[PDB]
Amino acid sequence: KVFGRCELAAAMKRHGLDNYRGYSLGNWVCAAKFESNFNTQATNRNTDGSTDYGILQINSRWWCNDGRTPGSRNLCNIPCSALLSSDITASVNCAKKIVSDGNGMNAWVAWRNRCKGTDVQAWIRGCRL
């Protein structure tokens, strides 16, 4: 499923991401745009055998188990397939754990490079939330 910007903003708001760990809602929408282009089925294989899954491109080396990654730790205690669902619940709950790891949203490369320090509120403007 490919979310619309405001459709995702609304869903993320319902999931309680607004100001989660101090990150306003726009940060999350912006992160999803650059990580997966709002695509819940996005996947990216890495040179270390791991794979990034879902709308927030969560890595199988640490957060979810896809049973094909060397040195996996499944800290979110979920199968990576749950991160490919049209229902973002699993991605959101894991993202909440990741952003609470100790280094904020910096864990998302796309967020660091295209969202951090920008006017992220722009990402929820017009959404009538």
Partner: nanobody, 125 residues
């Protein structure tokens, strides 16, 4: 990829200080963690101090807390290990490690969490 070069190793008397440098080449802000590991003679390699470059947060193994300080110069892809008040137990080959992927903090001092390594520098107390 990332190349890691260490420098600053050598002899130091117990109680003295030494500063190690780790210079990375092959990327800049894609590097996530820059970390120092060490391997004492006849022992297994252990994480000593880790630094997450995008926040400057640091993580230390208990035996060096308060004595060693890891810092960086993000612009130059440099990581430094200031070893203050060294002890005989600190004798070892110090090696720099790095990753271009996020690593949960709880595993930031584990060697298996790193994808790039320097060649090591000897420190003798």
């Amino acid at each position: 990829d990332v190349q890691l070069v260490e420098s600053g190793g050598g002899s130091v008397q117990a109680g003295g200080s030494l500063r190690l440098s780790c210079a990375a080449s092959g990327s800049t802000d894609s590097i996530e963690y820059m970390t120092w590991f060490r391997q004492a003679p006849g022992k297994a390699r252990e994480g000593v101090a880790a630094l997450y470059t995008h926040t400057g947060n640091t993580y230390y193994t208990d035996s060096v807390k308060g004595r060693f300080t890891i810092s960086q110069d993000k612009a130059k892809n440099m990581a430094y290990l200031r070893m203050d008040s060294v002890k005989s137990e600190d004798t070892a080959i110090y090696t720099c490690g790095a990753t271009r992927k996020y690593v949960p903090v709880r595993f930031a001092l584990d060697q298996s969490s790193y994808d790039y390594w320097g060649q090591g520098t000897q420190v003798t107390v």
